[PDB]
Subunit: 127 residues, 3 copies
């Protein structure tokens, strides 16, 4: 129902798609090759800038295949993409394995899931 | 409450329950004994298949106790269970301690939390606002 | 909009703030200087107690800065803070780096994000509906 405006800023940028009508999220594909050493983090670029309908955020979520088979995950999962973030989407990927992990161009390395936001007003009590 | 059709497919499978009335999530219990060595990751069957009412997902979340005391967590936390997934629920547990971690039949190793979903419609743009 | 009642229970405690009107979460600030050894976890106190309006939970999420530059994250991210919890907000911070990581009084170490709750009722059956 909700709307996300999207700008490609890299030749390899892809418009994320839902696999099925029941998918919670959409696959995010790398636009560049990144080597990630054992026991370290890399920043993987997605080559897209998003504008989300007010009232919504994006969660950037670890893919389970990569987690189970290479101990690779989104280190800040669920990574927060704020409604007012307009820069490039990038995934912080950790390699918790003893083996190197190559992110090739096109690789699905995270998922984007749209969620509604709810802003809190704080009311201080000496209670 | 929204509804979840559940089928047990292991004798040891358990209908998940909210510990309190105020709980966000329901507890997921292992059916198989699994050992998870240091700095590695194992897969824990729960022996259930879910069908969630339409327009909802289930996030599989790390229990805070296990994380704090044993450095164990759901590696894909929050693990996405899509509305239309009908296969067995399983939890990818990682072990970041320099020690063995043992999963025993009936051990609660994660939390399922239910959430509404929202579908984006992408609109391509030369330039944003 | 929803209401959170907050009680400070530590002198260094800060009422969390949203950086902007578009922010998903408010920053959680430590009240104690603590050192977290490499490849270990630490329970970091925020020195605040929360009453969330009925129907909302809180998520405690890793800050992206600390993850990328220090391999520091919230080990149970997203940390479930249930609606009926009136204790001290504490953050389970892991240091996955091979370096000591110092938390200082006032440091932003996680983000709390209000989400709305949904309880399931389980109906058991013999066979489920099919999909693709």
């Amino acid at each position: 129902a909700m709307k996300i405006k999207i700008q490609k800023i890299h030749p390899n940028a892809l418009i994320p798609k839902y696999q099925t009508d029941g998918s919670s999220g959409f696959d995010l594909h790398a636009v560049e090759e990144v080597m990630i050493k054992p026991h370290s983090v890399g920043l993987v670029k997605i080559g897209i800038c998003l504008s989300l309908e007010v009232g919504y955020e994006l969660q950037v979520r670890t893919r389970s295949g990569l987690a189970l088979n290479h101990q690779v995950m989104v280190l800040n999962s669920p990574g927060t993409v704020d409604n007012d973030y307009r820069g490039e989407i990038k995934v912080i990927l950790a390699n918790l394995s003893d083996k190197d992990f190559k992110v090739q161009v096109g690789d699905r390395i995270a998922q984007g899931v749209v969620q509604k936001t709810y802003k809190a007003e704080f009311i201080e009590c000496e209670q």
